[PDB]
Amino acid sequence: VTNVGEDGEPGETEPRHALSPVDMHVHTDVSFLLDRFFDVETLELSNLTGSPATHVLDPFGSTAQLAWARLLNTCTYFFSDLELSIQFKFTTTPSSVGEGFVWVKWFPVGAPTKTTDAWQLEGGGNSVRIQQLAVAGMSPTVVFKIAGSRSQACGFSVPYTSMWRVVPVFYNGWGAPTKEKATYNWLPGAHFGSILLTSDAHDKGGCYLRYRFPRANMYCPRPIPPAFTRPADKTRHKFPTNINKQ
Amino acid sequence: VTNVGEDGEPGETEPRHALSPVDMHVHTDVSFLLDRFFDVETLELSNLTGSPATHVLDPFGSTAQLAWARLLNTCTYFFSDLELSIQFKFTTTPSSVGEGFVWVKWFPVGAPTKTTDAWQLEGGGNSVRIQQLAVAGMSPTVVFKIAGSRSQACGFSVPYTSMWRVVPVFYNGWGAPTKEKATYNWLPGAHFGSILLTSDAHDKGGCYLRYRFPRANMYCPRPIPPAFTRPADKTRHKFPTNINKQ
Amino acid sequence: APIRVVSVPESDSFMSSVPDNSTPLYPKVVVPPRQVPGRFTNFIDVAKQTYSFCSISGKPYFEVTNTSGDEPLFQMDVSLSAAELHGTYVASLSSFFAQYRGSLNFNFIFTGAAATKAKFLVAFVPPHSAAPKTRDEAMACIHAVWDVGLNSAFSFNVPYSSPADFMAVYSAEATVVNVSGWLQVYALTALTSTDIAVNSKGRVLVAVSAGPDFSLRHPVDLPDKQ
Amino acid sequence: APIRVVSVPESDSFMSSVPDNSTPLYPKVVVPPRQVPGRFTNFIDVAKQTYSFCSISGKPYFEVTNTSGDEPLFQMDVSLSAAELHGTYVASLSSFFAQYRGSLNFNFIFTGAAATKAKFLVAFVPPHSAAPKTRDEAMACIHAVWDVGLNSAFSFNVPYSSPADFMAVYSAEATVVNVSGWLQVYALTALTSTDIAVNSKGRVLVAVSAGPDFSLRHPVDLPDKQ
Amino acid sequence: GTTYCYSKPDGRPPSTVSDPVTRLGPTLSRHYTFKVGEWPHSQSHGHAWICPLPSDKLKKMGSFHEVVKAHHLVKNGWDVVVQVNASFAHSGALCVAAVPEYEHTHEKALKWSELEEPAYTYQQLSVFPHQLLNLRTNSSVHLVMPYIGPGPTTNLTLHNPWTIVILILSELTGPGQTVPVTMSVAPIDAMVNGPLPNPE
Amino acid sequence: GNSGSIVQNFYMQQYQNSIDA
Amino acid sequence: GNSGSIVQNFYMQQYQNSIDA
Amino acid sequence: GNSGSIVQNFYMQQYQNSIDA
Amino acid sequence: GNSGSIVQNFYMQQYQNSIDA
Amino acid sequence: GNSGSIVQNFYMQQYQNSIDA
């Protein structure tokens, strides 16, 4: 009704002159936001010996009070590639480790996983045994030493290996014919694969896993959960900040 | 009157032949002068644990008897980008530190700041906890080890993040509606952001912050304060120098 | 033949957001065609093309009754940290960033019965000593008269007015870049009905969208909950 | 395939002024348009287009009285470290550099009343055993006669005369590149007035500007205060 | 002679307000005339009358005052003429400058006052747009200043970009009486934003 | 989005990332 | 002013610095 | 098959591998 | 005299040395 | 004979070896 300004008639609104651009919406770009390293997960090393289990790279159903957790939960289907940074931080005395090789093995979505120490290295009496699936071969094996290491880390890029054209972040159905409470929001292979960290350190320290998601694509936006509580009616939340009145 | 030389008439001045260029005024160029690392500030590391406060990068109202301090006070409004060099110098025995990771986090102008240890790393019994805001994510996290480090430093470039089109080095007014002696030459966000240095070293040593200001622009020149005292009438200041009569 | 190289001091460090990729170890994987509808590339677009309902006292609406007048029915300070903007998409998306710029579009939807009618005055009050308490006070400001029964829905744009090019997403004790004023809605007339025993009150749903000039910059990490 | 590289010995060192940038960690920030008047790009321009007042005994001027003659009213040695150049922009800007080249422009402004008059002789005396004590001595040098009451202001250029292409900003015990001589101002006649009881003295303000050929090179760090 | 401070004024509306901007015409933002104070023989070089614009005299700016008072933000320049009333037997000189973001004022913020400038400041005040007022040559200074500030507009209640500094370089000598300092101020290209509530 | 080095293609487009069909 | 390497643009102009509007 | 760097030919084709006749 | 690398001009001629007038 | 890098001429032919007359 009437539309634009200053007569005050019913339905009439005053003039507004829209602002000019400046930032160009570059920062709200989906793939820009996800192409950075995020500290998601922290994990323990397995001993060289025994029958270790692989850790699945699935950052999807998180509750973590971190920016990547909510963000990954903003869409229904997701596709992206992956980059990893694995670091190693001592939890004991750094002089406990004189060599400290760490074998990292990455497995594509669908890879077989049973391993037991099976590859023997021999030298002057004593010997060392590594896992059947830690050896360098078909899938990537990375070996880094923690001892004098200036960064006690490694890192590499890996692609989207799932069989699904897109990863369902939410799934209204079951991933298996038997409909068990377990296979509910499920679907097999809705992830990035799995890794196996193995080392004579294992005690002595842990890791720090960071994910970077290059080439991200999101489908079907979903509601974004709050993050903070609701302040009192008619008030404003007040947070500590850079700006703030001294 | 008469103008040029040798008749000695009232108002007449003798001939002067201006000198030819040589240096081309390159060194008095504003952005050239500011694009170099300056040792401004020195600061303490926070422990990995607790609720640390962030240090705001504001080199503007300085009194320091250093060249960057006066220079930054030569204009009314300033704009430039930023580069940092953070170093770490032991104040105890270098052998106290066997690993010494230092987490650096930079925050853009306006970023929320409350942190408490919240990310646990686990390994062989013992565990390590880092701040909520030290983790790698949305804003830059840099991690360097001090132990064997050949330079115990890190460094990176960051842009102008303020919301003001220009930073007022001087402000005749208040930055908040409540006019408190505090908010007087103020204006929120007239800076480069803030950093958070966090480490198991914290005691054991400190840092050394150097700023470099690429792309500097200065507006409205202001008076430049003296630096030295006034010598006696009709004399000259005499300083130790490279040249000086042996 | 070996190239003279000088190792920078920031050498073996991490730096999380480097503009460069890591080395690839599992090449040549061709990914299946992903048809699938509804891909979005920028969060600002879904914020602009979509509306959420506000949280007025925990409900997505305010009420007018047959007894109203003077006092404001809805009042919220213009800051993304405002309470009534709590459950919204725009407010929630904002927590990922440090600064915002632009307008917010609010649209009120009167859901009172067809046999019901009322008129509202909605005002945008700029920063001031203290917020008006009655409508005769606020009506001096930018305002619009909404006569339901002309249009059941009404859109009002809260403008961006500030000396700064961007304002803070995360508010705190009032600063010059913290708050932009207040949005208030008054009842120009109380609810009238065909039978007050059947319809005594009507609810106005209030929804928010990002305005056409709205923008968000500076991604930030989540601080301790509060 | 891995490239043969040889690490230089100065390898992991710092070197503060390297002509190169650090690695960027927070890309793509478009900065708001900064209109704002009065941007300056080179300090030498503001030094040349601007004047400051000297510090003659703590005041920005020297005085002539109805009793003057012979002796010099103003005397300063030509060195940026001179006392009377103390509070000036040109002197203060100079402390950031090691060497200077060029002329200085001094302009005297007679602020004595309109009913007042006097004549000055201003001389540039080159390095010498010891500085003239009377004007008949100095008048053998480069000088100008300023009759107030012809022009109330008078500009005089102190030239650059030296075998070196640049001289030192930071002076010390006299060297061949330390000092360039003296600037003196004498009273050719004492102040005359319409009534000596009303106006007995008049003050000449003395201001300095960088000359057209003036320049500064070699940025230097500030030494211990003195 | 007219001195433009940094640049000439513009009538461009603030880039940062998406709400209606009202351009006050000349007949609305008129012109106001004040006596700044009296320059005496006792006052010494370095002494300055500090006149932030306007803020302690906004209440005496009639029309402009009424309009500004009712709105939140204002962008505008000023046209000021400072004069002095002295005889041809008076000696002395002032330096009247227009300073952006002037501060010292010990938080007697936005109040016209008197202070003693600190030497390097009075010596170098000429580095800001100014004009010398030598009592043997002239009696007026005319400065025109554009809007200036960290952002495209401000709130005059909390910020006064421009402040006029009238400083004594050469003390007053000659006839015993004082020299009154006078000033005309006219808001220029004033633009106003966001109307405030009714004052009940 | 977020790859700004001239050296981002040190490895071919088919080795560095996946390829859409 | 003070960037003289041929490698000063190893990272794009929009990644290395800010950009004026 | 499996050599994707632009630098895979840092050494000439006759130095890096064997050559078929 | 004695600078024979292709990389001797890694830094511009005005940064690396002085310049004659 | 036995120099197969593209970088074998990182240093000029007159700096790297001797020159026949």
Residue numbers in the entry:
A (entry chain 1), B (entry chain 1): 1 to 246
C (entry chain 3), D (entry chain 3): 1 to 226
E (entry chain 2): 31 to 230
F (entry chain 4), G (entry chain 4), H (entry chain 4), I (entry chain 4), J (entry chain 4): 16 to 36
Task: Please share text taken word for word from the publication where this structure appeared.
Equine rhinitis A virus (ERAV) shares physicochemical properties such as buoyant density, base composition and acid lability with foot-and-mouth-disease virus (FMDV). The mature capsid comprises 60 copies of each of four proteins: VP1-4 (with molecular weights of 25, 25, 22 and 11 kDa respectively for ERAV). VP1-3 are composed of eight-stranded β-sandwiches, with strands denoted CHEF and BIDG respectively on the two sheets, which form a pseudo T = 3 icosahedral lattice with the CHEF sheet exposed on the capsid surface and BIDG to the interior. To investigate how similar ERAV and FMDV are in terms of structure and to probe further the cell entry mechanism for aphthoviruses we have determined crystal structures of ERAV at two different pHs, using highly optimised methods since the yield of purified virus was very low.
Since the pH of crystallization liquor for this structure was 4.6 (tests confirmed that the virus solution did not significantly perturb this) we might have expected to see dissociated pentamers rather then intact particles. However, the structure was clearly of an intact particle, although the disorder of certain features on the inside of the capsid prompted us to try to solve the structure of the virus at physiological pH. There are however significant rearrangements, and an overall loss of order, in several internal loops. Thus the entire first 31 residues of VP2 cannot be clearly defined, including the hairpin structure which is generally well conserved and is a crucial element in stabilizing the pentamer interface. The VP1 N-terminus rearranges to form a loop close to the pentamer interface underlying VP3 and adjacent to the site of residues 78–88 of VP4 in FMDV. It thus occupies the position that would otherwise be occupied by the VP2 hairpin from an adjacent pentamer and replaces some of the stabilizing interactions at the pentamer interface, however overall the inter-pentamer interface between VP2 and VP3 is weakened. In contrast the low pH ERAV structure shows weakened interactions at the pentamer interface, with no ordered electron density for the VP2 N-terminal hairpin, which is partly replaced by the N-terminus of VP1 from an adjacent pentamer which contributes a few stabilizing interactions, consistent with a particle en-route to dissociation. This structure likely corresponds to the transient empty particle seen in the biochemical analyses but both experiments are suggestive of disassembly intermediates not previously reported.
